[PDB]
Amino acid sequence: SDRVLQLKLGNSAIVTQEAANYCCAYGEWPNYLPDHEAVAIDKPTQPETATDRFYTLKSVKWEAGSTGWWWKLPDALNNIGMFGQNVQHHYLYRSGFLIHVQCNATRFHQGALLVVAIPEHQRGAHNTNTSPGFDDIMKGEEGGTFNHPYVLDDGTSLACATIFPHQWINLRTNNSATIVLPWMNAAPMDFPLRHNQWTLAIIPVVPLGTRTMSSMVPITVSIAPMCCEFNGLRHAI
């Protein structure tokens, strides 16, 4: 019963048949900003179905010695669709996210993915005391690749990364993972071009393995923003 799931947002829908029970982050569900927590006094635009819809990114090739992949939000979506046009024309921003990650293979394949959403994933660099630059962090739609995913590229640990909102894609059990994210910030709204609230990390804890014919196994990421607000209308940068 929990394996089949249709997610319908906007003009976008995703049916899955080999899923797990989906994850709502910290027990929370997204909502709009209420009046007793609001700060910016102008009326926000709530474009709804134009922006509250799945956005599918470029797939990544799950290969032999993969270390992992990360996308930062809302940076991965700031140039896609009418979400990216509302981002570039406004100063402020508030939304949650419905991340759906797809990866299937045959019943002779093995492997496990940790699909973990990390709040405020401040990265570190390796073997230097210079901070990571702008281009190391703000990758965009392509995202990045983990350098040392065993310490989550920040000196901490992959083993304890199940404290964050996560699921698994174990290839003998499921082929999809779904994490619903709310707004996760100290401020109620935020400038979307210089700050990322969530990082979606997908990490090969058990590598891909089979002895059947070699097929390309892709990992696809569909991200739906949820309950988007935008304040501070101006021109586009």
Binding site: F108, Q110, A112, V205, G209, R211
Partner: peptide, 15 residues
């Protein structure tokens, strides 16, 4: 395992 499964499988332990 059969001949097309990988002959070495993995566990992950949690506590």
């Amino acid at each position: 395992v059969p001949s097309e499964s990988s002959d070495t499988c993995s566990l992950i332990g949690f506590i």
